[PDB]
Amino acid sequence: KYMTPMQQKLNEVYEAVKNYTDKRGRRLSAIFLRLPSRSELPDYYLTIKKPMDMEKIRSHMMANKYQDIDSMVEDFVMMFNNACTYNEPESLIYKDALVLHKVLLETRRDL
Numbered sequence: 001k002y003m004t005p006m007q008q009k010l011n012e013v014y015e016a017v018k019n020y021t022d023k024r025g026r027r028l029s030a031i032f033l034r035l036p037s038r039s040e041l042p043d044y045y046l047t048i049k050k051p052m053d054m055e056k057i058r059s060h061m062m063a064n065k066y067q068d069i070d071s072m073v074e075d076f077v078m079m080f081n082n083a084c085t086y087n088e089p090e091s092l093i094y095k096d097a098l099v100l101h102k103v104l105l106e107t108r109r110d111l
């Protein structure tokens with residue numbers, strides 16, 4: 001029922017990305033939390049090879065499967081690239097992926 005020190009440090013890097021807010025308090029995390037089902041957006045699953053969202057990321061961290069931080073980063077990094085593939089470069093999701101990308105990386109250097 002407990003959480004390894006590595007788990008507690010993956011939760012921290014996870015939570016900072018989720019809770020990041022822009023200059024007038026919007027949470028960029030919102031659109032990325034969870035994808036609509038295959039039945040509700042087949043185009044996404046037919047155009048993006050390996051679909052990723054944050055609660056799916058959450059289910060492996062809280063459950064067990066990340067050996068270090070950069071292991072979790074690559075599913076985050078992967079998720080963003082998916083968003084930036086499916087959405088056009090000037091789209092909002094696209095830039096929020098970009099901004100959150102740096103947050104993830106700004107957080108990890110802080111160890």
Ligand SMILES: O=c1nc2n(c3ccccc13)CC[C@@H]2CN1CCCCC1
Nearest residue numbers: 031032033034035052053079082083086
């Ligand atoms: O790449 C992604 N793209 C989208 N979501 C995501 C949610 C979690 C992870 C990736 C993505 C939310 C759906 C959304 C894209 N959005 C779908 C409706 C039409 C406008 C674009």
